[PDB]
From a paper:
The GDP bound structure of [name] ([name]•GDP) described here is also in an “open” conformation and the binding of GDP did not have an effect on the global conformation of the apo enzyme (RMSD Cα = 0.350 Å). Within [name], the ribose and phosphate moieties of GDP make interactions with the side-chains of the residues Arg290, Lys 295 and Glu391; as well as with the backbone atoms of residues Leu387 and Ser388. The α-phosphate of GDP does make a single unique interaction with Ser388 within [name]. This interaction is not possible within OtsA as there is a valine at the same position. Nonetheless, the ribose and phosphate moieties of GDP within the [name] catalytic pocket are nearly superimposable (RMSD = 0.868) onto the ribose and phosphate moieties of UDP within the OtsA catalytic pocket. The guanine moiety within the [name]•GDP complex makes interactions with the hydrophilic residues Arg321, Asn323, and Thr366. The preference of guanine by [name] is mediated by these three hydrophilic residues, while the preference for a uracil moiety is mediated by three hydrophobic residues at the same positions. Within OtsA, the uracil is surrounded by the hydrophobic residues Ile295, Pro297, and Leu344. The preference of a GDP activated donor sugar by [name] (instead of UDP) is immediately apparent when comparing the catalytic site to that of OtsA. The conserved position of the β-phosphate of GDP is critically important because the bond between this phosphate and the donated cyclitol is broken during the transfer to the acceptor.
Our comparative bioinformatics studies suggest that among those reported as glycosyltransferases are also pseudo-glycosyltransferases (such as [name], EC 2.x.x.x), which do not recognize sugars as substrates but rather catalyze the formation of non-glycosidic C-N bonds in the biosynthesis of C7N-aminocyclitol-containing natural products such as acarbose and validamycin A. Validoxylamine A is generated through the dephosphorylation of validoxylamine A 7′-phosphate by VldH while validoxylamine A 7′-phosphate (VDO) results from a condensation of GDP-valienol and validamine 7-phosphate (both are pseudo-sugars) by the [name], [name]. Similar to OtsA, [name] is comprised of two Rossman β/α/β domains which are oriented in a GT-B configuration. As was described in a recent crystallographic study of ValL, a [name] homolog from [name] subsp. jinganggensis, [name] is a homodimer.
Residue numbers in the entry:
A (entry chain B), B (entry chain A): 4 to 262, 269 to 481
Write the structure that this text describes.
């Protein structure tokens, strides 16, 4: 079985050997390609992604057809980076941020005042076409010798790719996985006509479309039914038929990859106190502002003396106005929490260190993952799995993760400050035994959903859907 | 057949007789009750609504059981106004504005930043319950003598009423009509748990729930399926079964009621120019800001010389921040349109004269009803029916009206400025013959949807659903 994996980025580490000083390049561990390469059915794999750095650009120019990279067990993966036109790639990246598509799939628009699509939306869509073509060409090039290529297409940026693959390769298995939500039909069609229909056209020729959650699958089907009068959907079978394409929709949850010190000052600042931890990158969906306001409402209700709150953020796309504004709104809430509850009750630690975040998970006496919406949210699996304080988890009901862990957490409406405040109070009032037992159940529910099982689900699902599509 | 009609307001005109000077109270023509009273099946009718004025309060106190009011043809209707506790009433009215429920059903929230429900949402919901109880009691009291009462409950404010009527009258036909949209399940859900489920609990005991549009019916069914695990929906039959209640959903479109001078300065200002007219009350859903920006994009494109634009607004609930902000955003756009295109290219006429609005409809060379969303939008039926300039209509695809007239207008995504600009230019470029022919088809499509046909649809639909509910 010859695998061709496309994703937006292939995590490649660039450095010099500490002994020789020679340039070396190596794949990061836990990479999707790495895991796929270890599966039993896989004879070989190539990984196609975008050059997004100067090192990537250089590497791509050095090895245009791709560079073979070694893995443990003597396994190898052919990694090919694509050098897009910079202005195009640059524009497509802004098309993918909360300036457009991110707001579209992650529910960022109020409709009354935003959005208002101008000529920029048309240019962005044109550029997205050129970007999609670049990927399709690279992927087909890489797989030109292969008799029965299997295509795995990951990431929202590559939604246009399946249709182009299918045009050249009518009988190939093609899986598209989308890692973010799919919005309601009424919300999806906020997008300009050529975008709202063109993205569906790009996706449907896949054999299999996977999302992290049932809700996303249903929303996707409703979008298809709403916009594509030629399309026939079946909500029980989770299938679309459209211009002879039969597409199967699947839910394939992911939880975590099985693969330290707290940030400076945090351990002493937190000592002698119960610690509420909210963690997520600097993205408005992570909902930290509301978490802080809820924490304040809870503290007004008392019992929350000797309780502090940490807002751990990983800076990301701060150049996008919605992101910078989110951080600004969070700072405001934190400043106001401190003013009201007393100094240093709430801290933000905003910083990119995965290890610091895991230490925060371990230290927490209460974990809050109260996203406005989330495609899945892996942090809510990771955190209970490493936490050794029997911390309760408050989980928003709109995280894809809630479909798996909702029953084992305090599931909340992420927009209700009162409901969230009451959950904070109850979580902190709960006794050691009750928390110990609930934590154990939570860890049991989270444990099975590993990166490897999720990869196996993709391969198995695609195989079954490939047989079905062939028969029909 | 003894009809009991409940709505939020019964339009009553209070004055003195110009000859005698004696106090006069008379039902406004074209009221819903008036029309229902004229239907063939109807033996008598009572109308229950809220006292919302000093005159109403006084009239209610004078005739607590209700006052018989004469209609043409010697028909009469018993009109009973309810005196609610003022603080409860005042708070329920704010619950019903864009501060809460209006944003819920008319898609006003971005989720990332709004809303954040606090204790006010809980108090608002408590007050809503007291208000709902007031209406149910008054309705039951008015109909206490009736052997087989038929209940027609109109307006969103009365969504809680059917359940209370059903508790006391298990076998009565009850229709609830909702005049505004129903949002996608993911969006409805934003609401606090006790509200999002409590409202469904209140509505479902109706025999029949009507909306102006299919899309609303579907979104309602999805909301039920999403939140009420006990409920069984059928999307083809348009039914819900829940706790022994069988509820039928129906689409019952309304267009217009079959029943002058332009505002000061408008005729002369508009003379020698083609006139683009956008009309709607001061509510963010009417989308005038975007209409103006689109007009500007179109005028940049040229051909739009000797073209002016009127933004006709009817001031409503200006005390609501969303509404005042909308008017503010519209002024800003108009000011900027003039600065760019030349002085006095665009005018706002903001003012409650309904005859004036009709004159604007008649004068228009192009009509724009580009709502972000609209329960139905009757203006888009009225305007082509009175227009005598063969004006094209630009209609948002998110108005319930688009399900009936969409094919006969220029249907647009209300969030796409470019698409809307291109429709403005094409509509103004089109020749007299093509417009004359399109206007005639438009008027033919609009004409059948009268107030009376809509009332007949309700009675017929309810009757059929009552038989069905009885059998099952
Ligand atoms: N690079 C980096 N990753 C982090 C940091 N903190 C947490 N993470 C990881 O980033 C991932 C976040 O994924 P998820 O919770 O699904 O939210 P997402 O960011 O929307 O994918 C988790 O695997 C976290 O363990 C950090 O400071 N830096
Ligand atoms: N009272 C009043 N009514 C108006 C005015 N202008 C238009 N109307 C009428 O108000 C109604 C507007 O209804 P519709 O277009 O469905 O939008 P709605 O305002 O959301 O109900 C139409 O019947 C118009 O003819 C005005 O200035 N004052
Ligand atoms: Cl929606
Ligand atoms: Cl939605």
């Amino acid at each position: 079985s010859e695998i061709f994996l496309a994703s937006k980025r292939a995590a490649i580490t660039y450095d010099t050997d500490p002994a020789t000083g020679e340039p070396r390049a190596w794949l990061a561990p836990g990479g999707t390609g790495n895991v796929v390469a270890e599966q039993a059915g896989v004879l070989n794999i190539s990984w196609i992604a975008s050059a997004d750095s100067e090192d990537d650009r250089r590497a791509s120019a050095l090895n245009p057809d791709g560079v073979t990279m070694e893995l443990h067990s003597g396994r190898e993966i052919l990694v090919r980076l694509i050098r897009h036109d910079p202005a195009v790639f640059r524009n497509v990246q802004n098309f993918m941020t909360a300036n457009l598509m991110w707001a579209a799939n992650n529910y960022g628009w109020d409709r009354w005042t935003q959005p208002s699509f101008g000529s920029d939306a048309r240019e962005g869509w044109a550029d997205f076409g050129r970007f999609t073509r670049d990927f399709a060409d690279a992927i087909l090039k890489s797989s030109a010798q292969s008799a029965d290529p299997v295509y795995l297409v990951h990431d929202y940026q590559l939604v246009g790719v399946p249709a182009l693959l299918r045009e050249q390769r009518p009988d190939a298995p093609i899986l598209l996985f989308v890692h973010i939500p799919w919005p309601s039909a009424d919300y999806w069609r906020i997008l300009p006509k050529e975008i709202r229909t063109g993205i569906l056209h790009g996706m449907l020729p896949a054999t299999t479309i996977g999302f992290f959650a049932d809700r996303w699958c249903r929303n996707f089907l409703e979008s298809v039914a709403d916009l594509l009068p030629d399309a026939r959907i079946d909500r029980e079978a989770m299938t679309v038929e459209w211009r002879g394409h039969r597409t199967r929709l699947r839910t394939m949850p992911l939880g975590y990859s099985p693969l330290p010190q707290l940030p400076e000052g945090i351990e002493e600042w937190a000592d002698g106190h119960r610690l509420v931890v909210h963690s997520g990158r600097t993205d408005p969906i992570k909902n930290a502002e509301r978490a802080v306001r809820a924490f304040v409402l809870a503290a007004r209700g008392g019992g929350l003396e000797k309780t502090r709150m940490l807002v751990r953020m990983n800076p990301n796309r701060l150049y996008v106005p919605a992101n910078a504004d989110y951080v600004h709104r969070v700072e405001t809430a934190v400043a106001e929490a401190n003013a009201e509850l007393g100094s240093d009750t709430v801290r933000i630690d905003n910083d990119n260190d995965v290890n610091h975040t895991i230490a925060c998970f371990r230290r927490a006496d209460l974990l809050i993952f109260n996203s406005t919406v989330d495609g899945q949210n892996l942090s809510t699996f990771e955190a209970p799995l490493v936490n050794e304080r029997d911390a309760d988890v408050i989980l928003s009901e709109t995280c894809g993760a809630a479909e798996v862990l909702g029953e084992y957490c305090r599931s909340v409406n992420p927009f209700d400050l009162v409901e969230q405040a009451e959950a904070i109070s109850a979580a902190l009032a709960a006794g050691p035994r009750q928390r110990a037992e609930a934590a154990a159940r939570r860890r049991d529910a989270a444990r099975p959903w590993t990166l490897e099982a999720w990869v196996q689900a993709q391969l198995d699902g695609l195989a079954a859907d490939h047989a079905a599509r062939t028969a029909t």
